[PDB]
């Protein structure tokens, strides 16, 4: 609206809060689950 007063790096300002929330943590959980499912074959698809 006015670039109110000589603000800081807004991308960093928003990101340092962005990467603590449900969205990013769920992304990390999903990637971790995919990696863990890819890793082993002896578990037997234990997530049902």
Q: Does 43 bind another protein (CB under 8 A)?
A: yes
Tokens of 19: 């990467």
* Rounded CA separation 25/23 (Å): 6
Nearer to another protein, 22 or 44 (CB): 44
Cα 5 to Cα 1, 2, 11, 15, 17, distances in angstroms:
11, 8, 16, 20, 21
Q: For residues 3-42, which are near another protein according to CB under 8 A? A: 42
# of chain residues touching another protein (CB under 8 A): 6
Nearer to another protein, 2 or 46 (CB): 46
Residues near another protein (CB under 8 A) are 42-46, 48
């Amino acid at each position: 609206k006015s670039t109110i007063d000589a603000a800081k790096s807004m991308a960093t300002s928003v990101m340092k809060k962005f990467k603590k929330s449900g969205l990013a943590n769920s992304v990390s959980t999903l990637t971790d689950s995919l990696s863990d499912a890819a890793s082993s074959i002896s578990r037997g698809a234990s997530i049902r």
